[PDB]
């Protein structure tokens, strides 16, 4: 499913991402924008052979099992396909683990490169939250 900006902001808020580990809602929305263009079905294969899945492009080498990433750790305990659902719950729960892993949101290259240090609050502006 392709979300709208505010529709996504709201779903994420409801799922407790707002200020989760210190990151304001706009950080999450900005990341989803750049990681997947708000499309939950987005997938991208990496050279190492792992693949990224979902709104937040969560990686199969560490976080989810896709059956084709040798020596993947499956930290979030879910099949990668679950990250493509229109129901963002698995994505959200897995994101919470990742962001809690040490490097915060820097785990998301697109956030680091396109969101970090910018005015992310613009991402939730005009939204009924």
Curated annotation (Swiss-Prot):
Keywords: Allergen, Antimicrobial, Bacteriolytic enzyme, Disulfide bond, Glycosidase, Hydrolase, Secreted, Signal. The active site is at residues 35, 52. GO terms for cellular component: cytoplasm; endoplasmic reticulum; extracellular space. It is found in: Secreted. The keyword Signal applies. InterPro entries: Glyco_hydro_22, Glyco_hydro_22_CS, Glyco_hydro_22_lys, Lysozyme-like_dom_sf. Its main location: secreted. In the egg white and polymorphonuclear leukocytes. Monomer. Lysozyme C is capable of both hydrolysis and transglycosylation; it also shows a slight esterase activity. It acts rapidly on both peptide-substituted and unsubstituted peptidoglycan, and slowly on chitin oligosaccharides. This is Lysozyme C.
């Amino acid at each position: 499913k392709v979300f709208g900006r505010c529709e996504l902001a709201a779903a994420m808020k409801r799922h407790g991402l707002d200020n989760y580990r210190g990151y304001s809602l706009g950080n999450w929305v900005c990341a989803a924008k750049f990681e997947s263009n708000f499309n939950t079905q987005a997938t991208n294969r990496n050279t190492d052979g792992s693949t990224d899945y979902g709104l937040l492009q969560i990686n199969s080498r560490w976080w989810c099992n896709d059956g084709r990433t040798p020596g993947s750790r499956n930290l979030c305990n879910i099949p990668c396909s679950a990250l493509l659902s229109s129901d963002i719950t698995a994505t959200v729960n897995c994101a919470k683990k990742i962001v809690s892993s040490g490097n915060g949101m820097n785990a998301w290259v697109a956030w680091r490169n396109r969101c970090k240090g910018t005015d992310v609050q613009a991402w939730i502006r005009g939204c009924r939250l």
